[PDB]
Design a protein around this ligand. Sequence first.
Ligand code: GSP
Ligand code: MG
Length: 316
Amino acid sequence: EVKLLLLGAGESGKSTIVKQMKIIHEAGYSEEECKQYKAVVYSNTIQSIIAIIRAMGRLKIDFGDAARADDARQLFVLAGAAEEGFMTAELAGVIKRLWKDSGVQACFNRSREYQLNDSAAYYLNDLDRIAQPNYIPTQQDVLRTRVKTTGIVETHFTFKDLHFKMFDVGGQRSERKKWIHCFEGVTAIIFCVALSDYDLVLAEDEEMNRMHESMKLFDSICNNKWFTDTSIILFLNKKDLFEEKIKKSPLTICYPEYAGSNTYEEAAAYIQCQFEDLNKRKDTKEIYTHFTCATDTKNVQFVCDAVTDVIIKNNL
Ligand SMILES: Nc1nc2c(ncn2[C@@H]2O[C@H](COP(=O)(O)OP(=O)(O)OP(O)(O)=S)[C@@H](O)[C@H]2O)c(=O)[nH]1
Ligand SMILES: [Mg+2]
């Protein structure tokens, strides 16, 4: 019996790690299970293009082509279907024309100035596939869905002759009061951090830098004496998004004193050191840090294989 608890701020990747355990250890999502995520995929897609369209109003960005204004009108006329798990060719055409517009793209590339699902581009770039008749979400489509977690999710799987119970909680501010309900009998905490959060602000609070929020939570959890004997695993997640972002968005937005280059290795290491330095007991408390892409099954499989070996050695 091994109890794993996933913790971290909102949208850090916790529930995506959960989905990966099903894919890796329990043979993935069945066809009926994938069909259940169809409405979620469509809902995320519609919400993402709408979120960009909303931002254009706030940021005063015009459509590149004036013909798009009528498409934008038709979007809201037809959007109701997607929410119910249906995607007509007509709605798909509207979204596709909107997504390709240079004004919409300009707004998309300023997404740090508002709140946009990380999977927006993933779904929007794949419209021809997901709009097809009898579309059934792939494992990756399922991995890419976003639903804010409320309450506590408990999942089971077997791995290396061990029976794992994995607990997942919401990370947004409204849900943090529920974390304590999960504090008993924890073998290991997997604390997830979105590396790409460094230039974002909280959905709950536009004045709070997302990564500063994550640091405060990690500081709180890592140094809590209740967890002295609980293995602390740190997943620096969304490394794929971070790799792309670091090229174009200065890390100094988050850490004014960062003097390294705009490249993956130096910046990733610097963030790791920022979190690890929050550990007030470096000689007596180890943090097991891994860089992850939670949507990437192979990456998660090898990482969690390494993590599991640590957990076995240190708690068994
Ligand atoms: N590209 C990419 N997307 C990721 C990665 N990790 C998670 N995501 C995506 O980010 C979104 C949020 O991840 P999710 O697992 O729901 O966060 P959470 O920690 O559970 O969020 P919450 O329930 O506390 S609000 C999901 O759409 C998921 O597919 C990643 O490493 N790379
Ligand atoms: Mg979640």
